Write a protein that binds this ligand. Structure first.
Ligand SMILES: *[C@@H]1O[C@H](CO)[C@@H](O[C@@H]2O[C@H](CO)[C@@H](O[C@@H]3O[C@H](CO)[C@@H](O)[C@H](O[C@H]4O[C@H](CO)[C@@H](O)[C@H](O)[C@@H]4O)[C@@H]3O)[C@H](O)[C@H]2NC(C)=O)[C@H](O)[C@H]1NC(C)=O
Length: 400
């Protein structure tokens, strides 16, 4: 099976423990079948593909430092990913749709630019992690041209593929969290156009989208215990959906995240950790390593879990408690409620090595092509949690 490892290059320049330099990157490569370099973006002035950190990717040669890793790993495939929800442009918030709705000249510009990036820097292919509009978050019609958009995307994928054929370059698509395949993906038309598809079957709920309640963010199956949870929000529904639409199972990769979604709790959230957790208050304070409110890396989460040793810590240092439904269907929970001394409450939905392993087993059972891991920079590459580096990656590979 495949093990498609995403690499967010912004991780190269992170300060402290979050920094992922190339020697640490390379260690993942005895487990990854594919490396995907993230993320190129769209220029708001003409929507061509371009590096969102030219100084690093191009002027300090990081694109080709990473693709030249194939010299050391002759079976490794390296792709370049566009979008990935990392193309954040408040100045041009309609780029991805405008590219779909674009005139030939505009689309050709993108196709040519994206092609140039792949070829010039030694990549084996392109990942279209298209930033479509997502499911509207339920609080407490987003796109009325979805069907037009679906058609335009199919056509754009065909033309992109066409540009890559002569070189034999791969094309993958990534269906990003809460991107709805009914609205945008003409799945029977894609089998003949793309080498594989990555379903990002995680972040179904996040503190950014769902600041006022918390629930499992990447369960395999639907948890009946989560009241009123939308039934398409689980990995199995997404996978079966793609299979339903006639996509070959072995061209599908199951997305698994290495980071957790972390909500700030309130007194009114109560003391129990099984979701749905009410009266939450947006993202939890950022971690010191990952510096992203509402996100924590696996090492940051592992580092907070309660043990007999850290038992003595109190107040806002008291350790997090594990909640782990024994059916292995839903994924991990670690939390600390607002209570007395504890003023800073937090609820984290995440996969650890065991639960990621579970996802890998499911993928194997469903005869999928493999797993796509988002991303190496939040796996514990330094070995902080147990001493073993890349504990989530290795656990997944064990079971594919
Ligand atoms: C794109 O987004 C749309 C929503 O805008 C989404 O459609 C929704 O799909 C789900 C999943 O099929 C539908 O929910 C099911 O609906 C039926 C009928 O109401 C229920 O019988 C089902 O309940 C069965 O299963 C649930 C969990 O398995 C149980 O909790 C429940 O008790 C039942 O056993 C289930 O609720 C939903 O009705 C539509 N919604 C709308 C607004 O039309 C679509 O799936 C998304 N596409 C993808 C690929 O994600």
């Amino acid at each position: 099976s495949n093990l498609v490892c995403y690499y967010d290059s912004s991780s190269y320049t992170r300060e402290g423990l979050g920094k992922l330099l190339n020697p640490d990157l390379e260690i993942a490569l005895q487990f990854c079948s594919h490396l995907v370099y993230g993320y190129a973006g769209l220029r708001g002035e003409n929507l061509q593909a371009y590096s969102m950190n030219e100084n690093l990717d191009i002027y300090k040669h990081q694109f080709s430092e990473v693709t030249s890793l194939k010299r050391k790993y002759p079976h490794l495939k390296v792709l370049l990913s566009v979008g990935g929800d990392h193309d954040i442009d408040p100045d041009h918030p309609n780029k991805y749709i405008d590219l779909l709705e674009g005139e030939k000249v505009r689309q050709i510009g993108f196709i040519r630019s994206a092609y140039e990036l792949v070829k010039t820097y030694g990549f084996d292919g392109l990942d279209l992690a298209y930033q479509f509009p997502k499911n509207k978050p339920r609080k407490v019609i987003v796109d009325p041209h979805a069907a037009l958009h679906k058609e335009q995307f199919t056509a754009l994928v065909r033309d992109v593929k066409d540009s890559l054929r002569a070189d034999g370059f791969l094309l993958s698509l990534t269906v990003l969290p809460n991107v709805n395949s009914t609205w945008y993906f003409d799945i029977p038309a894609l089998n003949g156009l793309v080498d594989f598809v990555n379903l990002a079957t995680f972040d179904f709920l996040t503190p950014a989208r769902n600041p006022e309640e918390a629930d499992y963010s990447a369960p395999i199956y639907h948890p009946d215990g989560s009241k009123d949870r939308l039934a398409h929000l689980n990995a199995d529904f997404q996978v079966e959906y793609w299979l339903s639409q006639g996509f070959p199972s072995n061209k599908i990769n199951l997305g698994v995240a290495t980071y957790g979604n972390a909500w700030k709790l309130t007194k009114d959230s109560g003391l129990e950790g099984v979701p749905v957790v009410p009266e939450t208050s947006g993202p939890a304070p950022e971690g010191f390593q990952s510096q992203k409110p509402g996100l924590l890396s696996y090492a940051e989460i592992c580092g907070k879990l309660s043990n007999p040793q850290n038992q003595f810590l109190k107040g806002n240092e008291s350790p997090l408690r594990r909640v782990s439904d024994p059916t292995k269907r839903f994924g991990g929970i670690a939390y600390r409620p607002v209570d007395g001394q504890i003023t800073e409450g937090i609820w984290v939905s995440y996969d650890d090595p065991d639960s990621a392993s579970n996802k890998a087993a499911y993928a194997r059972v469903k005869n999928l092509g493999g797993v796509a891991l988002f991303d190496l920079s939040y796996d514990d590459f330094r070995g902080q949690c147990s001493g073993d580096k890349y504990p989530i990656l290795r656990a997944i590979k064990y079971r594919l």
